[PDB]
A paper describes a structure:
During bacterial cell division, filaments of tubulin-like FtsZ form the Z-ring, which is the cytoplasmic scaffold for divisome assembly. In Escherichia coli, actin homologue FtsA anchors the Z-ring to the membrane and recruits divisome components, including bitopic FtsN. In E. coli and many other bacteria, FtsA is the main membrane anchor for the cell division ring, the Z-ring, which initiates and organises division.
The EcFtsA1-405 and XpFtsA1-396 structures showed single protofilaments with a “loose” longitudinal contact between the IIA and IIB subdomains. We noticed that the position of the IC domain is variable within FtsA monomers across FtsA structures.
Author numbering: 6 to 388
The structure:
Amino acid sequence: DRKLVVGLEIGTAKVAALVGEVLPDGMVNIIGVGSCPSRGMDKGGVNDLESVVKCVQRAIDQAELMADCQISSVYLALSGKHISCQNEIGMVPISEEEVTQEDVENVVHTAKSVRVRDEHRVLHVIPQEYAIDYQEGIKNPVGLSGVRMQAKVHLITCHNDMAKNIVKAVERCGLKVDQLIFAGLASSYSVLTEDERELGVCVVDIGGGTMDIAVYTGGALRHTKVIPYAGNVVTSDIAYAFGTPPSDAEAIKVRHGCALGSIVGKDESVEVPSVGGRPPRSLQRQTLAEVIEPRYTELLNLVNEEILQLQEKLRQQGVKHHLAAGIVLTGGAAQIEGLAACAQRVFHTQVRIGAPLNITGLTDYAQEPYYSTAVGLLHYGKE
Ligand SMILES: Nc1ncnc2c1ncn2[C@@H]1O[C@H](COP(=O)(O)OP(=O)(O)OP(=O)(O)O)[C@@H](O)[C@H]1O
Ligand SMILES: [Mg+2]
Ligand code: NI
Ligand code: NI
Ligand code: NI
């Protein structure tokens, strides 16, 4: 009745710790929500271990109190520039004419047994499709009849050391790390429906530093990618354009920003403190949107031409390649006004801002786009 699951993300602008309770119908009951503005981490990783330990424990302490429980283990969200993916294929004999569960384990281990690059470590082994004698597109093949079976898997890889620092901070707080999970995978478990997965969809988590991408076609995970340019780059463009402190460029962006310059009133204006003991700067909301907008299109175009690069790859191998469900933009930096209409002009398909699904309890606090990554760590963990 009461085996909890805890998800922890040490983001670049936030440290989210959520305690969830899994219910009989698969829905996760959110009973604790902890948060802390991130500290001690720069554009690379950890630059002060004791600094992030303070902020990690602060979020854990907040979640521990809200749920009246004692956290002992977590599912740590992992991201970063050096995440990569591989698509492999295996093959194994359907002995006994009937598919055993051991056969699926054997054929998945066969496909993943390829030669992974030096200094690279396999993080996730996700089967995507099975084939039993000319019949493809199979997801649950156990119990069926056949002679030869082929399996296709998605291999998410990382580096041997790119998570060593954040694992210490969690352990320094007296916590076990149950599993490292790619943020894009966890984000896809929160905002994506199985209807959207079959129809073909791509989920993009726009955080403060990274852009975690996952593309699903035919109900199968086909692509994962991190792009290390997110909300902080938009801020630095505002601080650069108007000569402002980066802390007040982040403030004017959250309160007055807009990724679409066509929907801003002409005479709305916001004051801006300048750098170097110089006076305020009274720009206009539409002019400010004229700086935010082209940064968002350039970022989403980096994602668009990787989808296009993926579709042509999938289209040639006879695999479902069209994204009919569209794009789901989640994450904290996805809450800017006019982003959906702005992202529509880049992908030329339907776009929607996604929030975590299949949760109860404290949805008021957790059903936010900047919680999709850490809520998905709960959805993954209960399996
Ligand atoms: N209303 C808003 N408009 C524009 N940007 C916003 C808004 N609210 C938040 N952001 C941006 O969201 C970013 C942080 O989002 P989020 O909470 O998802 O980050 P994170 O999980 O710490 O980071 P990452 O996923 O990159 O590790 C910041 O860069 C901030 O500027
Ligand atoms: Mg995030
Ligand atoms: Ni590499
Ligand atoms: Ni083997
Ligand atoms: Ni086609």
